[PDB]
């Protein structure tokens, strides 16, 4: 056996069925409208059509052997898979796409390859493969842009075929609007036929004009309808490509808009030039060091399990040095790694001051910190990455000199990333884990007595 839809085998077969579906959606109408294309390379079209039909049969075989998800579990029962497949409209589409219409080659002739237009009814495999591709690829916006570009290309190709077939129905060279006479040596070439039809289709679907104006009323109707198709469908896909490119830089535009609003605020309230320069320095640091994105807003939809595993994988090295994690009973970390919030401090920021209410605990992701003196010029000791502090004032402690107030002032030399840990979150994690509470109380006592 049973093919899993989320596996690589199913995606590989999605590509292997998208190739004949793209081949049909281009070349069936290409050969139907351009008769010379069908007649000149008819052996190649026969081989490719037979291969595409074989792949269509194997695709219907796969659809009887692909497992659906019933109550969250993959179904391996072959009868259930076959019944599910045949109950869907996809089975009807596959049967309609694989009715053998090539027997009409023996009735209508070899120059009528539109008889296998029903092979276009495998478009759902194309769309399923494109939905599955953008999930797997590392450049989903680029792939979406290319897919919409492809849609533009196939719509232009279809309109080129329709223009050539309409010129054929009216007659080649009867007036200036239609494609010229085939007996012309330059305009009788198959390459010139398709390429000039593509040129007309591109100029009309982009609403440019610059083509011979219509003469007959049917040509006027078709030109009006094609310009309308180029204004409501083609311009829509062009705007969709523009919207995908806008969605590429959605976070970039949001960050820049926030910067611009802050700068407008500083411009109106007559903020001093030094403070404006240092705000710009903070934002330049934010963009340069790639800290413009917050893991809280990006991962807010993810569960606690997946956010926990991602945050352990991101913060493995910095949480290794922390004493309460991986040295104590070590079941605490999963409860706290969700609860840690990242904060960034500029050089010279005073993260806590003596006599200030300590409602939060800091774990140094990175950055040099310093337990400074009262004036701040003298540094007692430098805290490195992985160090944790602020634990003395966040908890009630026996023999507390001050209580609920910071005992030392710590300033960051250089920038610093810290895991802020609020008092309520720490108490939530520590009321259920007494060993970590005892260890943290002992650590707090060791510095507080000194």
């Amino acid at each position: 056996v049973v093919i899993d839809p989320s596996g690589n085998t199913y995606y590989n077969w999605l590509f292997c069925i998208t190739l004949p579906v793209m081949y049909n959606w281009t070349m069936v109408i290409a050969r139907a409208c351009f008769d010379e294309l069908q007649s000149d390379y008819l052996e190649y079209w026969l081989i490719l059509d037979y291969v595409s039909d074989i792949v269509y049969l194997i695709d219907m075989f796969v659809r009887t052997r692909t497992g659906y998800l019933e109550q969250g579990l993959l179904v391996k029962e072959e009868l259930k898979l076959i019944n599910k497949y045949k109950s869907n409209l996809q089975f009807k589409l596959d049967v309609l796409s694989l009715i053998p219409t090539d027997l009409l080659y023996f009735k209508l002739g070899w120059n009528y390859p539109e008889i296998r237009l029903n092979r276009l009814l495998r478009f759902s495999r194309m769309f399923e493969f494109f939905q599955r591709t953008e999930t797997r690829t590392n450049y989903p916006n680029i792939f979406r842009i290319s897919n919409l570009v492809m849609y533009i290309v196939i719509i232009i190709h279809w309109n080129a075929c329709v223009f050539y077939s309409i010129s054929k129905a009216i007659g080649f060279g009867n007036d200036t609007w239609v494609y010229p006479d085939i007996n012309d040596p330059e305009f009788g070439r198959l390459a010139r036929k398709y390429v000039y039809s593509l040129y007309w289709s591109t100029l009309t679907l982009t609403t440019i004009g610059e083509t011979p104006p219509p003469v007959r009323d049917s040509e006027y109707v078709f030109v009006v309808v094609d310009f309308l198709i180029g204004v409501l469908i083609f311009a829509t896909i062009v705007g969709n490509i523009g919207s995908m490119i806008s969605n590429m830089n959605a976070a970039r535009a949001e960050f820049q808009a926030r910067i611009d609003a802050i700068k407008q605020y500083m411009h109106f309230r007559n903020v001093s030039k030094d403070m404006e320069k240092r705000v710009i320095k903070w934002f330049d640091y934010l963009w340069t060091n790639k800290k413009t994105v917050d893991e809280k807003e990006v991962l807010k939809y993810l569960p606690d399990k997946l956010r926990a595993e991602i945050a352990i994988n991101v913060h493995l090295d910095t949480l290794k040095k922390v004493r309460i994690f991986a040295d104590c009973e070590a079941g605490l970390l999963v409860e706290l790694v969700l609860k840690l919030q990242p904060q960034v401090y500029s050089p010279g920021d005073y993260i806590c001051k003596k006599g200030d209410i300590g409602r939060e605990m800091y774990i140094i992701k990175e950055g040099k910190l310093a337990v400074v003196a009262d004036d701040g010029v003298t540094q007692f000791v430098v805290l490195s990455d992985g160090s944790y502090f602020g634990e003395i004032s966040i908890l009630n402690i026996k023999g507390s000199k001050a209580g609920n107030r910071r005992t030392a002032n710590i300033k960051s030399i250089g920038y610093s990333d810290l895991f802020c840990l609020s008092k309520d979150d720490l108490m939530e994690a520590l009321t259920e884990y007494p060993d970590a509470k005892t260890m943290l109380e002992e650590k707090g006592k060791q510095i507080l007595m000194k």
């Binding site: 989320s6 969250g72 009006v224 807010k300 259920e432």
Partner: protein, 433 residues
């Protein structure tokens, strides 16, 4: 019948569609008969018959369809041939309908130009169509397409009037008179309102003024058209775009920090399963948008009986049950995820909405000693213990994608402090078990 509800009657939607077709006939055919010479005395009786049919539709709507439309003024008023009709007569809809049915006989089609003023019926029919018809962006595409078609229709009639005003064929700019007049004037309107160009250039002052105004209106109408289609596609694909944006931001976050492909594949699988099944990334954002009664009732109709089936919550007040139903957090689990671990402490109760979980035990694990289907509840004993002194007796895995509800500790406590009677009930239940 005798009194229909305009909000939820399909027959009223059909009649409103008929009124829309009459108004569309008036709007689309007044400039045709004004500009184009399609109202010759050979077929003037057809135009008069269809105009009088549309006027009869207008009269039927204003007399026997809009009067019997029930309303609300704190309660449903279905008073047949009473103040239900008087509310319509006091409304602006009746004033617009009577102003739109102005009788001008005097055969100039512009005298029927009041008939275009029954546009409130068109908007009412549209507003019914975003309600009763799902996938409503298709009708909005059709509506903006019809707006563009009508704009080109008016421009074609204006161009034919400009051509006949200067004489047909007098200049290369005007319509020459060869072939179908409406089709070629519509061709001019398409080449102009889309600002495609390619037309013969204007020569006289009136032609240059007309072409200038028509290009200006064309630039603005093309901008309106492209903005309308952009808005329709952006609103229709808003959920898909938001899901793709969140998923790609998550994926680039993992690729930034070099997350291994197993965790990345698990997160992508969660994203695709949540989007395909739930249809949204977080149901809680939808629930907080709702009124409180709707959210509470939806929690009821989802899992009220399933919650009330457990013996621990039996005997407690129903309002605590309502509150915990409001506080249940629905989360899906990937296959072979450890919902519970033997060494992990118990904090939360699991209520399987869908899927199967397996309790492992015995020698070295790897033995399904009991499986729980949808509607089961496990992990309730962790709700009883206070101070964190609870642990899972055995590890529980999710055999497949399992959507299940969470009632964690300090939330059950947060609603226990609201109900002291239930506080005593759960205290004695914890002391017994």
């Amino acid at each position: 019948p005798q009194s229909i509800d305009p909000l939820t009657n399909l027959m009223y939607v059909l009649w409103l569609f008929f009124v829309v077709m009459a108004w569309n006939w008036n709007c689309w055919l007044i400039p045709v008969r004004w500009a184009f010479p399609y109202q010759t005395p050979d077929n003037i009786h057809h135009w008069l018959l269809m105009d009088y049919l549309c006027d009869l539709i207008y009269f039927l709507d204003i007399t026997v369809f809009q009067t019997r439309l029930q309303f609300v003024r704190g309660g449903d008023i279905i008073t047949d041939k009473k103040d239900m009709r008087n509310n319509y007569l006091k409304s602006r809809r009746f004033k617009m309908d009577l102003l739109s049915l102005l009788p001008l006989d005097f055969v100039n089609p512009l005298l029927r130009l009041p008939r275009c003023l029954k546009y409130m019926a068109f908007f009412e029919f549209n507003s019914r169509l975003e309600s009763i018809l799902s996938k409503a962006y298709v009708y909005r595409v059709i509506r903006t397409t019809a707006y563009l078609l009508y704009s080109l229709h008016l421009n074609s009639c204006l161009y034919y009037w400009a051509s006949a005003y200067q004489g047909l064929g007098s200049t290369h700019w005007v319509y020459d008179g060869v072939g179908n007049s409406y089709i070629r004037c519509y061709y001019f309107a398409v080449k102009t309102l889309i600002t495609i160009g390619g037309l013969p250039d204007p020569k006289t002052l009136f032609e240059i003024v007309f072409q200038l105004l028509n290009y200006f209106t064309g630039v603005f109408a093309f901008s309106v058209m492209i903005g309308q289609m952009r808005d329709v596609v952006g609103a229709a694909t808003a959920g898909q775009t938001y899901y793709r944006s969140c998923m790609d931001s998550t994926v680039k976050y993992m690729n930034f920090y070099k997350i291994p492909k197993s965790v990345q594949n698990r997160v992508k699988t969660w994203y695709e399963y949540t989007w395909h099944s739930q249809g949204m990334l977080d149901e809680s954002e939808l629930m907080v948008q709702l009124p409180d009664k709707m959210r509470l009732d939806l929690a009821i109709d989802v899992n009220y009986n399933i919650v009330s089936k457990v013996a621990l919550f039996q005997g407690c007040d129903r309002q605590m049950i309502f509150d915990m139903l409001k506080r249940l957090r629905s989360v899906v689990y990937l296959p072979n995820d450890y919902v519970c671990k033997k060494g992990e402490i118990g904090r939360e109760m699991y209520i399987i909405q869908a899927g199967q979980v397996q309790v492992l035990g015995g020698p070295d694990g790897k033995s399904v000693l009991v499986t729980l289907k949808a509607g089961s509840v496990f992990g309730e004993i962790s709700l009883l213990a206070v101070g964190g002194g609870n642990r899972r007796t055995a590890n529980v895995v999710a055999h497949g994608f399992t959507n299940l509800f969470i009632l964690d500790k300090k939330d059950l406590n947060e609603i226990l402090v609201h109900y002291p009677e239930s506080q005593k009930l759960l205290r004695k239940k914890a002391r017994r078990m």
